Write an enzyme that holds these catalytic residues in place. Structure first.
Site, mmCIF file in Angstrom:
data_model
loop_
_atom_site.group_PDB
_atom_site.id
_atom_site.type_symbol
_atom_site.label_atom_id
_atom_site.label_comp_id
_atom_site.label_asym_id
_atom_site.label_seq_id
_atom_site.Cartn_x
_atom_site.Cartn_y
_atom_site.Cartn_z
ATOM 1 C CG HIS A 44 8.508 -25.722 -11.656
ATOM 2 N ND1 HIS A 44 7.583 -24.942 -11.718
ATOM 3 C CD2 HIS A 44 9.007 -25.951 -10.723
ATOM 4 C CE1 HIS A 44 7.338 -24.485 -10.262
ATOM 5 N NE2 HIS A 44 8.487 -25.092 -9.952
ATOM 6 N N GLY A 70 1.960 -20.166 -5.487
ATOM 7 C CA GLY A 70 2.434 -19.007 -5.945
ATOM 8 C C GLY A 70 3.973 -18.697 -5.633
ATOM 9 C CB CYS A 95 7.363 -21.382 -7.688
ATOM 10 S SG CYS A 95 6.837 -22.987 -6.721
#
Ligand SMILES: O=C1CCc2ccccc2N1
Ligand SMILES: [Cl-]
Lengths: 301, 306
Positions: free
Chosen positions: A41, A143, A145
């Protein structure tokens, strides 16, 4: 003595965290050998995330679209591919800090250490359980992720988790390192909810053993019970059923303390029905279910 | 979102942990530049444990009595001296993994990460606070002595604790990295007991500010309190006195949430009177006192979930 929620030492993993930028999105990557792993993503604008076609969005991209940064050092991306919900960026340079590692998928009720990272920079480490509903109760901001979850077995790091999203309840969902989600979740901005959670019964019992080992024994009682009898109490209290498998895994702690599991189940049965009668157990007012038998054995012996 | 007992990444400290052996005694030391720091009680024997004369037992030691081991590398000790309750072994190699570091002595209420270590191998990392009675509620088995507590604010490792001993009530006592004990404790096995412990009030308030940031509002009330009236109530639950300093330090969390410190104090007075009535805050059914205002701001967003 003493008992604390304890993460693995994170240095073997700290050495693997890089920063990954694709357009405006920055988040975290895992740099193992000559590949960098991150959520697919990353490649998605806001409009994209509403209904992403990753096949199509990805072919449209090239290697130079991906800015991978290990501290102050640009890695050259020389190839990109998708595996499930994980993006794999082949780089020109193998990680000289790569540890002995495997990719493992964990079972609900099993614990792991999360190394929360921001802009590729390790920020914090905390222990988490894979909930029965396949969420984790993390601590994650924008952030986070690509932050990874792991276990250490002797010298081998077992990577089990990559952080993808927060759910509307404040709990967290992600994948194994092969990009397969934990739980019935998709990497798309859409309506997604945490299934109703259940308490991890074998872990609560491990934590009562730890409490006993640390001289907290008030909840103990002369009684015993049977799986069937207890499991009907468990079922009622939103507790995972206790299998003959869980009773065996507890065998070490049952030994060391001279309480048999069904003896301890008797104690837990009463705590569910009658509450804690105002007291605490290892400085908790709750029945803590995020320590496994192994966590208790590892820490206490 | 979410809120967790969160330790610092331990890698910068892992790279400094060694095994120190003296006589039949093995514990951990901290290898920074050409120095290994370890508790001086490593040089004690059976009898020595009650009234050790450290200056006498040390003057009788050669460098080669100290066996130091970094994984498999044996570091060669070229010197020794004592600073207070810490032993400093000079070695023939500066640790190549020495980070930016500094030594700070902390105050009660301060938090740090503990890298629990056995035989110079890290076993786990967790968060502790310096209790008002100058102990920490650690997880320390035999061989853990020389394990250190640290913060890593901005790539610099602040060393603030080295583990010396477990007291009879199961709590842990240690020194700064200059070898001065926290509290009235001594590195002798003479009878010593921690003072009665109190809840770290400023920390409890910071944690309630965390709950509000994370969207929890059920425990607020339309009430306020004077600082004096709050102290006279809080101290009847064995809570630390809240000072103007503590009030000032909460200003930023007050500003971010728009709840005055003394309003939040009224909420705490009520929580102390009522308990939780079957509820939980940030996943706990007790009032948590081991997050500082600084820890709350570090871990939490700049946007509240109102
Ligand atoms: O922290 C410590 C210090 C040494 C020790 C000896 C025996 C039992 C427990 C411990 N724990
Ligand atoms: Cl301090």
């Amino acid at each position: 003595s003493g008992f604390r929620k304890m993460a693995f030492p994170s240095g073997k993993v700290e050495g693997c965290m890089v920063q990954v930028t694709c357009g405006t999105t920055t988040l975290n990557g895992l740099w193992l050998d000559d590949v960098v792993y991150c959520p697919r993503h990353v490649i998605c604008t806001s409009e994209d995330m509403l209904n992403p076609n990753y096949e199509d969005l990805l072919i449209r991209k090239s290697n130079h679209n991906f800015l991978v940064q290990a501290g102050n050092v640009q890695l050259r991306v020389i190839g990109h591919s998708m595996q499930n919900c994980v993006l794999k960026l082949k780089v020109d340079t193998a990680n000289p800090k790569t540890p002995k590692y495997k990719f493992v998928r964990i079972q609900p009720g099993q614990t792991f250490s999360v190394l929360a990272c921001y802009n590729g920079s390790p920020s914090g480490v905390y222990q988490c359980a894979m909930r029965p509903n396949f969420t984790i109760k993390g601590s994650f901001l924008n952030g986070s992720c690509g932050s990874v979850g792991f276990n250490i077995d002797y010298d081998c790091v077992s990577f089990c988790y990559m952080h993808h999203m927060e759910l509307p309840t404040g709990v967290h969902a992600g994948t194994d390192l092969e990009g397969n989600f934990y739980g019935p979740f998709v990497d798309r901005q859409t309506a997604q909810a945490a299934g109703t959670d259940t308490t991890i019964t074998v872990n609560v019992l491990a934590w009562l053993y730890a409490a006993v080992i640390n001289g907290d024994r008030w909840f103990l009682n002369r009684f015993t019970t049977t799986l069937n009898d207890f499991n009907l109490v468990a079922m009622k209290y939103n507790y995972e059923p206790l299998t003959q498998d869980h009773v065996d895994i507890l065998g070490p702690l049952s030994a060391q303390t001279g309480i048999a599991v069904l003896d301890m189940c008797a104690s837990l049965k009463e705590l569910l029905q009658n509450g804690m009668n105002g007291r605490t157990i290892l400085g908790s007012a709750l029945l803590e279910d995020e320590f496994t038998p192994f966590d208790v054995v590892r820490q206490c012996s």
